Write a protein that binds this DNA or RNA. Structure first.
Ligand SMILES: Nc1ncnc2c1ncn2[C@@H]1O[C@H](COP(=O)(O)O[C@@H]2[C@H](O)[C@@H](COP(=O)(O)OP(=O)(O)OP(=O)(O)O)O[C@H]2n2cnc3c(=O)[nH]cnc32)[C@@H](O)[C@H]1O
Ligand SMILES: Nc1ncnc2c1ncn2[C@@H]1O[C@H](COP(=O)(O)OP(=O)(O)OP(=O)(O)O)[C@@H](O)[C@H]1O
Ligand SMILES: [Mg+2]
Ligand SMILES: [Mg+2]
Ligand SMILES: [Zn+2]
Ligand SMILES: [Zn+2]
Lengths: 343, 346
DNA sequence: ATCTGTACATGTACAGAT
DNA sequence: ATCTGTACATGTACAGAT
DNA sequence: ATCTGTACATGTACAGAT
DNA sequence: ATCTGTACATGTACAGAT
């Protein structure tokens, strides 16, 4: 049943092969351009992020997320109000972008990508119209199949993480205190998402990647000499329910996969043992994930896993009407064996 | 009962504090002297190894082990007669130690030793001499009188960043215990060659750095022994075994062939045999220690104790230790085992 | 003026002491 | 139970060198 | 600085065994 | 139906060469 949905959602080895080679062709060429041209983004290094690289992509290999991280010689951050996740960057190449303005830096970035994309004759690839706010430059590829690639510009800072994350990332009873201390020794990132035009947002896409691939309390969880768990299959099922519901109801435009990602990070923290995620219990795991997500909706409360004061379900960001709509549609599919999965 | 031996074995913070103060002064001075003039060992880097940095040093903080490791490219190893553990290494500053292509180990260790002895001669804050050279030892031992006697093994080590030698391919069998990602990463760490002998140009593989990692990341659960996880008795068992051997080794010179590396190796195998943290519950410390003794006894009797990292190397082979010596320790361990461990009260 | 090997500065797991 | 010294990892400053 | 080579993780695909 | 074993595929860390 739920197994059979997971069979349907599984990407195909050939589809992975074909899509990956076209995306890699494009992304390498853009990344060359930022380097072997004396631009403000020389030094930018590639970091792959998102569900395709976390092995939780469903249905088709048709969406890829790539960070072009750029190391910045220190530091000065100022928190935008007390939102937790938005910051003004203050303090050379980047002199053309002044306070370091996200909009002006993104526009140059965007302008380089668009130029280099006009110079692609090998692949059918366009630049999607800019979505205000959003930190991404989105490529639309078409080797028959439609594939979209998000090129995310990011700042890399090696200093300690901002104070708003001090109580974040609570993996101590799950992944433990050494894993946490080491993760927090990694750099943190800032992306040019706005709010207004000078604000950057914290990104922890590199930390979420590690956690998805290091998700057990036992070191052998999901390894060739360990037990398989069903944590990723539960994420996929929950991502699938929201994709089907969003595709049908335009009332759900304000929800996104990151809401599902954040909720299941919390669930994993509350149920740390690998046995609470035994494959033979895929049903009650998916069901307890649903119950948790409904508790989040009912209480209009879903805190950023790394930034606890930042409520992703705050009234300011999603209306109570949108949440009660989602809770009714979800409770429905739940109590009727998920008809939506058969579409 | 066994909880009380461990209390006796526990180090005292005051002793730790005074001992580490002097040791760090001396070591830092030797390391800085290695970085000066036209010194061949310039670039050498420091790596603290051994039981003190693993937190399984027992009774007193009176024996420290430090590698002075030196990176070298080129590599070109040649295994010494299928033994698994011993190798030949084939304006370069190490030029003075070549014997045509081949890096002589005793030549390097002499020049290393001459430098340490000179630096100890100029030390006047601390009472420290250099111990007479021991055959079959890559160390330059310092004896410090801190009033208290404290020895320091300065181990000279070559560092190589290439893949580990073929003889370790089937070694380090942690896949069911610490798992395969940890194994892959560990084997991406460099490996080390110390000048232990066999003749003056043979080096021995060293994995002190890997053993130090394993000692401090020893559980199947990532939270083993952490402040939000369960305590285990894996290190408490190793301590008790170190102590049984130490007590016995200082009464019976029938046991000079045996060393604490033997008990360290047997227990890496026990930790592989019994991966789960539940097989090392603190409340089953008697039975845990007991199975470890059973295991060590079988190794003595079958004379077989494979190097944890180099499987074809048998530390209990007949060419290394007599049947005589192994049977003598089998009786003495069996005796302690079945009479309440009277040696613990000495 | 800039560069850099060295050593300070920061943070925290570990485990002994209270 | 909390307090606390040592070890160790990684970031950063700077006297002396270029 | 840039790039290739190497190893093995995480996947998919499928047949023979259970 | 599920487990095991082998082939097949891409992603990623980093040593060594240039
Ligand atoms: N912080 C970020 N780090 C890296 N990439 C980011 C980040 N924030 C945004 N992006 C990328 O920009 C596009 C638009 O961003 P929005 O913030 O406007 O909306 C996000 C998006 O609509 C959705 C999920 O996107 P994603 O592709 O990352 O999903 P996935 O995990 O790879 O799985 P699937 O593709 O299979 O669904 O969630 C929104 N969102 C809100 N906050 C965050 C966040 O903190 N991190 C990531 N996404 C967030 C996006 O397409 C995104 O790629
Ligand atoms: N025979 C050996 N073969 C391989 N490695 C060895 C051998 N003897 C010692 N070593 C390595 O050198 C380290 C130091 O050895 P040493 O004899 O000081 O033991 P230890 O583990 O430090 O314990 P203790 O000092 O309490 O006896 C060991 O931890 C091990 O990594
Ligand atoms: Mg995505
Ligand atoms: Mg020692
Ligand atoms: Zn798992
Ligand atoms: Zn433990």
């Amino acid at each position: 049943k739920l197994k059979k949905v997971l069979d349907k959602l599984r990407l195909k080895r050939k589809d992975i092969s074909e899509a990956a080679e076209t995306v890699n062709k494009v992304v390498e060429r853009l990344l060359r351009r930022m380097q072997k041209r004396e631009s403000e983004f020389k030094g930018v290094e590639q970091l792959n992020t998102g569900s395709y690289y976390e092995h939780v992509k469903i249905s088709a290999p048709n969406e890829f997320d790539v960070m072009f991280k750029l190391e910045v010689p220190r530091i000065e951050l100022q928190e935008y109000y007390e939102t937790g996740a938005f910051y003004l960057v203050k303090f050379n190449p980047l002199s053309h972008f002044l306070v370091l303005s996200a909009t002006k830096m993104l526009s140059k970035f965007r302008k380089i990508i668009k130029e280099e994309v006009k110079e692609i004759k090998d692949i059918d690839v366009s630049v999607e119209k800019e979505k205000p706010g959003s930190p991404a430059v989105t490529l639309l590829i078409r080797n028959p199949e439609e594939i979209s690639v998000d090129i995310i510009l990011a700042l890399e800072s090696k200093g300690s993480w901002p104070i708003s994350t001090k109580e974040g990332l609570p993996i101590q009873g799950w992944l433990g205190t050494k894993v946490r201390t080491n993760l927090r020794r990694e750099p943190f990132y800032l992306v040019p998402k706005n709010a207004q035009g000078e604000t950057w947002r914290l990104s922890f896409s590199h930390t979420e990647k590690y956690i998805l691939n290091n998700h057990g309390i036992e070191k052998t969880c999901c390894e060739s000499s360990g037990a398989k768990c069903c944590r990723k299959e539960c994420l996929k099922l929950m991502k699938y329910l929201l994709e089907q519901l969003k595709k049908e109801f335009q009332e759900l435009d304000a929800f996104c996969s990151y809401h599902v990602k954040t909720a299941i990070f919390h669930m994993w923290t509350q149920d740390p043992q690998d046995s609470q995620w035994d494959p033979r219990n895929l049903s009650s795991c998916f069901d307890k994930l649903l119950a948790f997500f409904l508790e989040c909706l009912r209480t209009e409360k879903l805190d950023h896993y790394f930034i606890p004061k930042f409520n992703l379900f705050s009234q300011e960001l999603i209306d109570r009407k949108s949440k009660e709509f989602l809770s009714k549609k979800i409770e429905y599919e739940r109590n009727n064996g998920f008809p939506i999965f058969d579409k």
